RNA sequence: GGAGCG
């Protein structure tokens, strides 16, 4: 039964690494009484290690879109829970999204605004922050050719995230291939 | 009303030059301000620029170093083949050994030194030296 | 500036960096789908909805909670008036004024106020009619202008 | 303040404070909402807890609110 | 300036202005060239300083002073002034 | 407690109110105003005037010849410090009105070529420093709240009117230069009377 | 010498 706590795409077989997340996440719907009732709908489609720096990994597990606001309501809790079982790691939520490309020349196929490549990797960077709730964006241009984003972050959520700003700009980078670095405005 | 955001952006950057401003900011943004100030960016001809998201249009602040003589853009946007370039450079460019003018081509936007090295022509957005 | 005017007025409202609710906004879509219908049955137009909502029921953008403006919300209850409120109004005016010239001849003013209003009925339905928000054979029409509104 | 004696980019606090809400590097309203029922601080309805004005509701002297 | 051997082809290379970058010319009367002498631990003048050039333009502008005091706020930073 | 050099200039500058500026201020002096008062009169940031001190004597002290410095006022209560500020510093003090073409003129008895010019107030002053931008002559003045920085390569920020304002901020001034020649020893002190620079009325 | 293209 823990095999129903993944779905992934195709029906594909999971690996060696999603049978142990979805393996944690069995122990904890029957384990911990606080999760027993939300866990119950609760499920993933895949899960990745990335490494951060330092010997450290974060665990990125992506969730169907149709339950990505379940997961907030019990976001915070659950983070805690997968983090000791996986100690030493980050576990990091990010809802599946399609990007369909840009139709062609002359083209009369239309493409909903969600899909493009620039609202997914907003989206992204929305659910790879939580709890904190961005609050400006910066995108510099160096002189070299390269550019950096830097992304504020609300001050209020600073507890759950200030020890997190590392895998966050290492996560995003992997799923986006750009720099971000996170901050805090004085208040 | 706004009809070129590009000349507002180039204008008030060549006024803040003049002025010895080290900063400036243009307002709206646009991807065509952007993919020209790196044409000028890649030049030397402008520092660090940053743009500010702010849920509308965007602003840019530019860092500015000095070096920049004059900036326009060309309006309308005539057409200009590959054969037609010396022409439009003898034209607006200060001499034929500095100075470049912008062109938007199906290839993307760049100086028109690097469109005879492709063979690409297209349209006039501006020039700057 | 101003359409008709020389006015260069720029106030205006500020919307927010932050597109979410606030954490103590705790009325669900669905409650505030609702009310906006509720209220359209009353006959309010969605910017008097909106208005009640923000000073009434602190929702400041309903676009935050439900993801739709106002006039979406209520024409997918088909519950859009047929004419566009800001169209309406202006019908609603132009009436006035030519009720009020009717008995006064000789104020030139008011005359040529109601070639500004006329003209901005006119320059409105033509888009209106662009978009398909108007019937393709709608005309405004001065002599049963005044059965439409009011 | 002389303009390069000035960060576009990192203006003071207090000086954004007192800029039009349209012309600061990211606008931003004035407005709020407080509670007593969540009242809009310029209301343009009577709730008498406030009384509208041509700027920020009157409110009431008897009453206390709290700024949300 | 450079022949396409390599020689020098200009009478001479004018100063650029240390706020505005421009460049003095012959007649820019109104240009000001300043030393700044550098100290010890002690706080005696070692015969070294930061040479600045300013053009007339910006000294008929009134915003020398202002162009002087970060030019000199960044410097004295570098050469281990204080 | 022991002051260090820059408490007890200040400490000296507060007591001859050298940081009472005018009730208006010229916006390329806002930079060193700190606080205006509901009396409607600016308070000059003093902690900005010692820097600015500062930074004048290492350009007095780099000039190799100190007769190429001309310290002028052409109000009566500088008159006084101008001619102490040169007695010591080595300076060519020039007290009283300006003859115009000294700068310019070469063919006239006064005619002058200094390096650097040191005046009291930009707003009085301003013959003297509409004539220096002719000859790539630089200039340092005290400027008060409401001066124009107009030609004004080093502005120290000070109330310029006072006679007590005058005296010290030249008195100050005189003894940094020479503190940095190794002439006399450091410190705040110094063995000249300040009240040697003070207007002596008739 | 200063001012003005004069
Ligand atoms: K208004
Ligand atoms: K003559
Ligand atoms: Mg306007
Ligand atoms: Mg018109
Ligand atoms: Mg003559």
Redesign the interface.
């Given at each position: 039964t823990s095999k129903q706590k993944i779905h992934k795409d195709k029906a594909a077989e999971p690996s060696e690494h999603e049978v142990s997340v979805g393996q944690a996440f069995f122990d904890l719907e029957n384990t911990n009484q606080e999760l027993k009732s939300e866990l119950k709908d609760l499920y993933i489609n895949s899960a990745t290690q990335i490494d951060v720096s330092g010997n450290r990994k974060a665990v990125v597990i992506h969730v169907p879109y149709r339950l990505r606001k379940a997961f907030r309501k019990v976001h915070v809790r659950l983070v805690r829970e997968l983090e000791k079982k996986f100690s030493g790691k980050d576990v990091i939520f990010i809802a599946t999204r399609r990007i369909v490309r840009p139709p062609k020349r002359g083209s009369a196929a239309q493409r909903p605004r969600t899909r493009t490549l620039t609202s997914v990797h907003d989206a992204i960077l929305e659910d790879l922050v939580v709890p904190a709730?961005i609050?400006?964006k910066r995108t510099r241009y160096r002189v070299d050719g390269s550019k950096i984003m830097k992304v504020y972050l609300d001050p209020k959520e600073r507890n759950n995230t200030e020890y997190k700003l590392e895998t966050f700009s290492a996560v995003y980078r992997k799923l986006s291939g750009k720099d971000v670095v996170f901050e805090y405005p004085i208040t | 009303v706004r009809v070129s955001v590009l000349n507002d952006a180039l204008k008030s950057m060549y006024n803040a030059e003049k002025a010895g401003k080290a900063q400036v900011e243009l307002r709206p943004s646009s991807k065509v301000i952007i993919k020209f100030l790196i044409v000028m960016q890649k030049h030397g001809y402008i520092g660090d620029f940053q743009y500010v998201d702010?849920?509308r249009v965007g602003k840019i602040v530019v860092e500015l170093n000095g070096r920049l003589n004059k900036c326009g853009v060309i309006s309308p946007r005539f057409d200009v083949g590959v054969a037609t370039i010396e022409g439009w450079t003898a034209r607006l460019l200060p001499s034929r050994q500095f100075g470049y003018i912008v062109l938007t081509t199906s290839a993307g936007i760049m100086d028109h030194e690097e469109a005879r090295r492709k063979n690409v022509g297209g349209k006039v957005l501006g020039f700057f030296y | 500036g101003r359409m008709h005017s020389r006015g260069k007025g720029?106030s205006?409202?500020?919307?927010?960096?932050?597109?979410?609710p606030?954490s103590?906004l705790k009325i669900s879509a669905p409650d505030v789908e609702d009310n906006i219908c509720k209220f359209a049955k009353k006959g309010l137009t969605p910017s008097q909805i909106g208005?009640?909502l923000?000073?009434?029921?602190?929702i400041?953008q309903v676009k935050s909670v439900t993801g739709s403006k106002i006039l979406r919300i209520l024409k997918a209850h088909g519950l859009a008036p047929e004419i566009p409120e800001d169209l309406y109004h202006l019908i609603k005016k132009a009436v006035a004024i030519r009720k009020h010239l009717e008995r006064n001849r000789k104020d030139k003013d008011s005359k040529f106020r109601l070639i500004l209003v006329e003209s901005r009925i006119h320059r409105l339905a033509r888009y209106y009619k662009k978009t398909k928000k108007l019937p393709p054979v709608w005309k405004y029409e001065s002599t049963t202008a005044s059965t439409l509104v009011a | 303040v002389l303009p390069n004696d000035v960060d576009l980019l990192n203006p003071p606090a207090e000086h954004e404070k007192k800029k039009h809400?349209?012309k600061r590097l990211?606008?931003?309203?004035?407005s709020f909402?407080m509670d007593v029922t969540?009242?809009?601080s310029h209301?343009?309805?009577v709730?008498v807890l406030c009384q509208p004005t041509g700027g920020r509701a009157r409110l009431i002297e008897g009453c206390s609110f709290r700024r949300? | 300036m450079q022949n396409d051997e390599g020689q020098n082809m200009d009478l001479y290379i004018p100063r650029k202005c240390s706020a505005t970058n421009r460049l003095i010319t012959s007649k820019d009367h109104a240009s000001v060239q300043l030393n700044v002498g550098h100290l010890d631990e002690s706080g005696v003048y070692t015969g070294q300083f930061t040479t600045y050039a300013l053009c007339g333009f910006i000294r008929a502008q009134g915003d020398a002073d202002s162009a002087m005091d970060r030019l000199w706020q960044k410097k004295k930073a570098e050469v281990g002034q204080q | 407690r022991t002051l260090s050099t820059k408490e007890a200039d200040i400490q000296m500058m507060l007591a001859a109110e050298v940081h009472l500026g005018t009730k208006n201020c010229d916006f390329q002096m806002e930079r060193y105003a700190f606080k205006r008062r509901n009396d409607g009169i600016y308070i000059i940031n003093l902690g900005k005037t010692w820097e600015k001190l500062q930074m004048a004597a290492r350009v007095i002290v780099a000039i190799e010849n100190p007769q190429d410095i001309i310290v002028q006022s052409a109000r009566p209560y500088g008159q006084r410090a101008v001619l102490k500020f040169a007695q010591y510093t080595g300076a060519h003090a020039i007290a009283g009105r300006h003859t115009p073409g000294t700068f310019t003129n070469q063919l006239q008895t006064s005619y002058s070529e200094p390096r650097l010019l040191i005046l009291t107030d930009p707003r009085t002053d301003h013959q003297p420093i509409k004539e220096a931008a002719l000859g790539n002559i630089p200039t340092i003045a005290f400027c008060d709240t409401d001066s124009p920085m107009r030609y004004v390569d080093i502005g120290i920020p000070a109330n310029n009117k006072g006679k007590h304002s005058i005296g010290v901020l030249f008195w100050i001034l005189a003894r940094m230069v020479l503190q940095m020649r190794g002439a006399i020893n450091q410190g705040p002190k110094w063995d000249v009377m300040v009240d040697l620079f003070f207007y002596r009325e008739p």
């Open positions: 709730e609050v400006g | 702010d849920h | 720029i205006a409202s500020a919307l927010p960096y932050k597109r979410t606030p103590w208005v009640i923000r000073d009434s029921h602190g400041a | 809400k349209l990211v606008q931003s309203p004035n909402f969540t009242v809009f209301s343009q309805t709730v949300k | - | -």
